[PDB]
UniProtKB/TrEMBL annotation, chain B:
Protein's name in the database: Alr0221 protein
Superkingdom assignment: Bacteria
């Protein structure tokens, strides 16, 4: 199956859990969603961290038509952990091989979860910008830990018509 | 500095496989990518390619697109080269500025594994790099880049289109 990891868009400065997306944050995120739809991308489901920042990013993705289903999961919060998400969320879901799922979260959570899925442990070697995305292919059978593959990693700027 | 690893474009199917050249669609696709890279304001101080025809033809298309003015080639980028010799006898010597942006045109799994070595210190075979696909890395201006670099971009040709 395909897992897409999207970092929330630019939010206001300084609880931080309530910081909302700023004007440029919404604009940039909208541009990303538009380009994705233009490319013909779609997600069966979008799962988001409960923090406002993420939820608002997820809403923009939905409004663009990228998906029609939304779910919030505490696993995606800054204090969540991939192992519980894998065993108590992903595995039970029993998604088909052709599934395309997007998760909207935070750093360094997303990059680390990615390194764990690719390498087997966090390494902090990936640069994931706000409204940026990572595309991974996870195995159907067995744990995806250290057995996944990355086919996409991009910041918002490289999704624009010119830069 | 920044490192841009580009796998060669589509070539003929399996004479000597080292002489296999790009296909009509391979040249086209690569041109689209090059032109796209231009619009994305991408500039390369130098384009270093593998001696094999597949790579060189892909590197020439990138050079022609105006992506760069210099085109050099090293055997280290050949299917049988090793990252460590390339780093000591090519990269280190060049002594590029911390603001340099170099493009490398090579083959798989060399490019993907070299990236993994630079990011994690060892190859893992976890990255998918398509032909004419590209990977963007950031190397620290201090110390060895082995297991100390950062990746900020990885995309296949299809996601580069509008
Ligand atoms: Cl960006
Ligand atoms: Cl492609």
């Amino acid at each position: 199956m395909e897992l897409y990891l999207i970092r929330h868009g630019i939010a206001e400065a300084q609880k931080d859990e309530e910081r909302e997306l700023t004007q440029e944050g919404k604009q940039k995120t909208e541009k990303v969603a538009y380009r994705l739809v233009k490319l013909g991308r779609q997600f069966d489901l979008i799962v988001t961290s409960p923090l406002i920042r993420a939820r608002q990013t997820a809403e923009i993705l939905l409004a663009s038509g990228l998906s029609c289903q939304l779910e919030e999961s505490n696993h995606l919060a800054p204090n969540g952990n991939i192992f519980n998400w894998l065993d108590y969320w992903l595995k039970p879901k029993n998604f088909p091989e052709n599934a395309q799922i997007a998760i909207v979260g935070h750093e360094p959570c997303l990059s680390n979860w990615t390194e764990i899925l690719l390498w087997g442990e966090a390494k902090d070697s990936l640069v994931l910008k706000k409204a940026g995305m990572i595309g991974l292919k996870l195995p159907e059978i067995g744990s995806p830990v250290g057995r996944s593959q990355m086919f996409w990693l991009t910041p918002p700027r490289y999704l624009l018509l010119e830069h």
